């Protein structure tokens, strides 16, 4: 699950640029044509305040960062692992509601002792 989160953050945690070239039902664009467009929109040579001037038949689309709760998956994994190894959840740098105080806290720390 840890490896899955890491791979998912790389693919889906960051937005990605999608440049779409040509008119819909228009003239087809070939690979050699896209190489010149790639040179113009290269994220390597782009700076934060670059501006783009185009005709109507260039679309600068974005693959958004797609939301998933990797924090919740980590908490679940850490809960499973800590409870399996018999440690309290707090040993795994993970908190939990209601369990941090009072007779709930007394019981879990008594169980550990």
């Amino acid at each position: 699950n840890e490896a899955a989160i890491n791979q998912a953050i790389e693919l889906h945690g960051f937005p990605q640029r999608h440049v779409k070239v040509g008119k819909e039902d228009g003239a087809p664009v070939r690979d050699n044509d896209l190489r010149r467009v790639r040179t113009i929109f290269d994220p390597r040579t782009t700076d934060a305040n670059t501006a783009y001037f185009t005709g109507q038949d260039v679309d600068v689309e974005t693959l958004e960062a797609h939301n998933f709760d990797y924090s919740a998956i980590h908490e679940m994994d850490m809960r499973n692992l800590t409870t399996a190894l018999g440690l309290p959840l707090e040993a795994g740098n993970v908190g939990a509601d209601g369990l941090g105080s009072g007779k709930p806290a007394e019981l879990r720390f008594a169980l550990l002792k």
Binding site: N80, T83, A84, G86, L111
Partner: protein, 75 residues
Amino acid sequence: ASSTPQTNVDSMGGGDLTFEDLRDIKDVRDSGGQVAQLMDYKALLNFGEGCEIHVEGDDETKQLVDGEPMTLSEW
């Protein structure tokens, strides 16, 4: 009254549990994970603080066990 139970006790000869059922308990226990840890916590709550032996009138029991005085609690 009487010196033997005169009420009957609801089992002989069968049709209560097999060696296969006994080994299922073993499998749950050795399989680890959350179920095993919870039932280990149950054992620790019931039995984990250890014990003390009390004999009433312990001082009266004073006897030489093997050339040394002991009470029954000491023994």
